[PDB]
Amino acid sequence: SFFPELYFNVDNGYLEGLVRGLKAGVLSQADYLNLVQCETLEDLKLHLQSTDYGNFLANEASPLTVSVIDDKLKEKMVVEFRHMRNHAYEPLASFLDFITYSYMIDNVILLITGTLHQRSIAELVPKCHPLGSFEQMEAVNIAQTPAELYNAILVDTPLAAFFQDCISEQDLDEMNIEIIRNTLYKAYLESFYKFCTLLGGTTADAMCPILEFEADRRAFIITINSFGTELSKEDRAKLFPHCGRLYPEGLAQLARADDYEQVKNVADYYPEYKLLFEGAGSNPGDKTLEDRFFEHEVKLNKLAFLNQFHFGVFYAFVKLKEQECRNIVWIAECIAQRHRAKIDNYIPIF
């Protein structure tokens, strides 16, 4: 409609320019091959120094390990993300707030289980994944009381809206932490999809398909791993986000699925996942299904960069650059263990 392509630039031109530049700054397949032509961690640092990466291990320990490079990549991600977020305006700021909630959920999961089993808060503070903030008081120094942290979540933590469905500390103690995070994750996807659809422009077009695929992916793998573990089928179906092509039909066959081939049959009705399952041969020594999913997500991110008037570019570079970080980590692991026969087990970022 006419609403987009006019107001967007007026208040996001600089941020679009910055994110497009950082997108152009990605490392191509040639850079990955150059890094692969290292055979040592020192040469890996040098290959990083040939681009905007590197130059961070200066003034540090001479020996090099995986943890050092992982911490540096994470720190760079955090610094650039916070720097961009600070210079933003509310329509974009809510978007980045959703992007931060996606990790707030992980951090709140980490914080709990350190109170049911008495553990200090401050020792968990560094363990929290960065971008966690939690600069709000009364979540700190809860006297290790589940009621205290629950009230702090409801009051100070912005996730109170999602915690309107996980309440009373009964789910906190009885029911498994993993399912708590899964339910909160589903609710967060629902809220994020609804907020995106409220912004019915290029942003909606960009983010509706990606979230659709993400939810459908999650439901598929939920059904894949649920077979070998104790789990009621209804308790499995209640973890499927409704914002997908599966919800009108297909989620039900997954709810009553029992084996891998039935899940394959459900995915067969949808060619978009038929190709991904067929490419997922599950062979001993080849790519696996989640690698196909990562490839799908990465190419959708690349597709998102073809339009200028959407907030999706920011989410896109976040996902693509953390995928780049994971690729760097995997190449480092292959180098360290001298398993150069498995160097070709990372998804490129185009």
Partner: protein, 99 residues
């Protein structure tokens, strides 16, 4: 014992490589694992083998059988976790034998 030591090394490196693959798939499961430790699913039975006039101490891999931990949070690479559990179980059995 040296050959069992080479086998221990090989199995350990295989387990480490599978761990690296799982780390690529998942990232930060280790904190979750280390924080939540409740009951042991493999214990050791003290045993005796009187092969001569004196009695020798030996042990048995007694599978006590506590349920494992569903870790469905870190992108849910369940295949990787099951493979890691299997490999480390073999490593534990071999190490108990050598002990």
């Amino acid at each position: 014992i040296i050959e069992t030591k080479m086998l221990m090394g090989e199995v350990m490196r295989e387990a480490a490589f599978s761990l690296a693959e799982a780390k690529f798939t998942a990232g930060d499961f280790s904190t979750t694992v280390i924080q939540n430790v409740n009951k042991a699913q493999v214990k050791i039975r003290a045993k005796k083998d009187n092969v001569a006039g004196v009695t020798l101490p030996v042990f048995e891999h007694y599978h006590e059988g506590t349920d494992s931990y569903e870790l469905t949070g870190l992108a849910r690479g369940g295949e990787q976790l099951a493979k890691l559990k299997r490999n480390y179980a073999k490593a534990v059995e071999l190490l108990v034998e050598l002990a």
